[PDB]
């Protein structure tokens, strides 16, 4: 395995799918308008994220749709126009594309184009995301950069069960249409303590998970765990102190936390599983260069997936793993 997973009242050990269920549970209990729907959600979903909710809340609030993603998102928009909370599920992020027009032309623009007479702020679209070891072209994709070029939506990716429940509760409650991408490899990979009761993590705020003084590393989702290990390799093998940052919200993103870090370190490495070209690291890199030009001691490095579709048998060679990141960091330190 390419990664290692490593105040608020009572907590229980939860894996990532359980913490999604807890978030959904808390939401349906406190918001009578809230409904969950999409493909195969009724029996508990193909990743188990909705287990027991239809029994608890009723078949009118947790239900299967026909197999039509443009319909699922159009339907969720319509529910949210009435003011009801619509939690739509898209079965894999790779299958969000049939809904792209509903998301980009419709949900993102609904408030703006109506002068705020109408909105779909109460829509959240949840979708498993990212590589899984063997998902190949259509069960592995990270589409966040496609959505980052769309003013009007929020895109949010957690790195852990505690983060997932707090960020999902934030998306569900946020007054803007949100896409919540759940790293599917983490669904059943290590548990942590998660508060039983509802709590929120702020959107548009990065988290500095480890302080450092030599270089700034930025990632999101599973890749955070990859950079955490890179920090460890760098301290041990090179005596390099790394500041590790989880971006968490893709848009609108926390420009200030990133620039502040880089102003202190002078070096930045961004890493994501998505292809390099057009990937979201490009937006981060461009912006930091613009704000921290006087502070930058080395070219900003992006360690990303290659500019190919996501392969089956070659996955171990495709992903921006700890060695790829370390080497790039080594070279950036030698610059």
């Amino acid at each position: 395995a390419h990664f290692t997973f490593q105040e608020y009242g009572q907590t229980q050990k939860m894996n990532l799918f359980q913490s999604v269920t807890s978030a959904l549970d808390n939401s349906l209990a406190k918001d009578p308008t809230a409904v969950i729907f999409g493909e195969d959600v009724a029996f508990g979903g193909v990743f188990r994220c909705t287990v027991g909710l239809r029994d608890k809340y009723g078949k009118d609030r947790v239900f299967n749709t026909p197999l039509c993603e443009q319909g699922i998102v159009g339907f969720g928009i319509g529910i949210a126009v009435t003011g009801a909370t619509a939690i739509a599920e898209i079965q894999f992020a790779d299958y969000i594309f049939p809904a792209f027009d509903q998301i980009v032309n419709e949900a993102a623009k609904y408030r703006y184009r109506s002068g705020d007479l109408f909105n779909c702020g109460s829509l959240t679209i949840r979708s498993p995301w990212g590589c899984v070891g063997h998902g190949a072209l259509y069960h592995s994709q990270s589409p966040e950069a496609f959505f980052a070029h769309c003013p009007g939506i929020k895109v949010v990716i957690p790195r852990s069960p505690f983060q997932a429940k707090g960020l999902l509760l934030s998306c569900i409650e946020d007054k803007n249409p949100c896409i919540f991408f759940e790293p599917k490899i983490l669904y059943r990979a290590a548990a942590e303590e998660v508060p039983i009761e509802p709590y929120n993590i702020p959107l548009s705020q990065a988290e500095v998970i480890q302080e450092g003084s030599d270089v700034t590393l930025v990632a999101w989702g599973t890749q955070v765990h990859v950079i955490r290990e890179v920090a460890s390799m760098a301290k041990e093998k090179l005596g390099v102190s790394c500041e590790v940052i989880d971006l968490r919200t893709i848009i609108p993103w926390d420009v200030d936390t990133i620039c502040k870090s880089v102003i202190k370190t002078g070096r930045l490495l961004i890493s994501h599983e998505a292809p390099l070209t057009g990937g979201f690291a490009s937006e981060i890199s461009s912006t930091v260069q613009e704000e921290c030009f006087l502070n930058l001691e080395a070219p900003i490095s992006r360690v990303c997936g290659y500019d190919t579709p996501f392969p089956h048998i070659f996955e171990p060679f495709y992903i921006p793993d700890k060695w790829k990141c370390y080497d790039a960091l080594r070279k950036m330190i030698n610059y």
């Binding site: 239900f63 319909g71 159009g74 339907f75 009435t82 408030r111 109506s114």
Partner: protein, 390 residues
Amino acid sequence: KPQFPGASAEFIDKLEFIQPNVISGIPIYRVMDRQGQIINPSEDPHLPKEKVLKLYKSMTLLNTMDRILYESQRQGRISFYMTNYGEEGTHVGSAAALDNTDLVFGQYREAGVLMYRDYPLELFMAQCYGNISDLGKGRQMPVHYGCKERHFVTISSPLATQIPQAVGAAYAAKRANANRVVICYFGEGAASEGDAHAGFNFAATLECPIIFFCRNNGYAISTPTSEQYRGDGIAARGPGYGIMSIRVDGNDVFAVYNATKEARRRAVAENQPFLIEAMTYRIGHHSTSDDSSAYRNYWDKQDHPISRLRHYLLSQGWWDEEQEKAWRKQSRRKVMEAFEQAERKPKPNPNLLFSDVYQEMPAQLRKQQESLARHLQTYGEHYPLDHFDK
């Protein structure tokens, strides 16, 4: 007996393809003839005088407004316009059969629904001019109307996207236990998009109180229905989805009203979708960007919704030449008053270009707004500032 989960059916021991019925399609429901005479007394809705007069005056006021705004576009006073000629009957017949609070989604050629719901002339014009009175804040191109007060969801240009949204809003109403229906208008062209198939199927499987209302006017821009589909119109698709369906004469206000009234009653009661296909003809160009003589008039002179309704009113003793003259005049004045006021208003503050993208304004977006402000301080002589508010 067959056991398969996917269909309820018998076996047949002989190979026989199901042929479509396109030559003898679903018949077209009609209440009044082209002379405005009732054909079948038991179908007459017997609408009271004041209501029928309101249907009539709404359709001629829309027609008056269409003429004036079409001219305004030709002269470049507004950037764009789409008329509603020939389809005025489908708009007002259907809107009159709805409750005031039934939620409407449309396409762009349904302004008579808003007119029937008493949307001010000032506001139709504010949107077409993008002026300060526009509650849409001048952001969308002309005829992209919306009204929260009158439960008319803001139009957007992408065809058929509103179909599965209407279905979601209908689901929510069901849950709310609303005694409310949602109606969803689209043309025959838009019915070709994937979103139409999504909405139709979702409506039926999720059991939604919705009316799908298809204006079949024979063309999508230049494309005749013969290149749009090969089955019997839109109405014949409904049954395949499990949706109750009817086809009506879209030039007959009372046929449209009757079907809409009964669909509404039954949709709300049963939580089931109804499909109405109103057969009409697009008498104008597609829009101001279209010269329709490049691809194709009887309809205007011999089968027009407004003339038919006018013949009906005369048959009851409800209208005459004098009243027609005085109203032609009052409506011209009402429209020209709104028009002059709309032209004299400033456009909204250029600041409004940045608000409502999200509910709140993100800080990076505020920084772009600040950038514009500083830019205009230095370079403002190069911008049409004197037309814009503040």
